């Protein structure tokens, strides 16, 4: 298991690589046995789209008591926790771990 | 069916389907005899009752009834909080009643 946390496997999603294929620029009009070196300056743009199917496991607790739940607080603030902020700059306030839900041992 | 077999067994549970939940609770009671057997007529007169606001006609009878027109007896706080963060609405659909191992003293 990844001490940092998550999933080990000996295949894990491959290593999805790209990139720009150069373009020459105008090269001599004498033969010349070099690689070029003048290029015409690139770059691209796209969308990327990822799709993920994660399997669950449901609880079957008999606890009486109600749970921890992770929630968010009602209490008046300048900002929307995890939204945008007057900039319209994204923000993750805090990290949100897993483990809320209880089993025995 | 007889004296020394139980007419049913102890039903408390819950289950949770994808649409639907599934409330099922027991409990042992006691019934005394109530009014030694008779009807009576009450009144605000038969209480001590004064005011024009409190005043009341009717009769107590030596029957007893069964309710069960609360949430809690049927769901856990543990299945209510299941059911108010994971749902936007509920509603009964039908009933299953049960009266088993009579014992009169």
């Known amino acids: 298991s990844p001490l940092m946390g998550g999933f080990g496997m000996k295949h894990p999603p491959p290593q999805i690589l790209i990139k720009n294929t150069p373009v020459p620029a105008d090269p001599p009009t004498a033969f010349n046995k070099d690689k070029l070196n003048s290029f015409i300056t690139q770059y691209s743009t796209g969308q990327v789209s990822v799709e993920i199917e994660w399997e669950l496991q449901k609880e079957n607790s008999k606890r009486w008591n109600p749970e921890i739940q992770y929630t968010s607080n009602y209490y008046k603030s300048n900002n929307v926790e995890f939204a945008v902020n007057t900039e319209g700059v994204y923000s993750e306030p805090r990290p949100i771990g897993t483990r809320y839900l209880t089993r025995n041992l | ?105």
């Open chain 2, 1 to 105: 069916d007889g004296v020394g077999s139980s007419s049913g067994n102890w039903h408390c549970d819950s289950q949770w389907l994808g649409d639907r939940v599934i409330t099922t609770s027991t409990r042992t009671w006691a019934l005394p005899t109530y009014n030694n057997h008779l009807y009576k007529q009450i009144s605000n007169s038969t209480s001590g009752g004064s005011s024009n606001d409190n005043a009341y006609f009717g009769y107590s009878t030596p029957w007893g009834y069964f309710d069960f027109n609360r949430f809690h007896c049927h769901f856990s706080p543990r299945d209510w909080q299941r059911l108010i963060n994971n749902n936007w609405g509920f509603r009964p659909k039908r009933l299953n009643f049960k009266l088993f191992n009579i014992q009169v003293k």
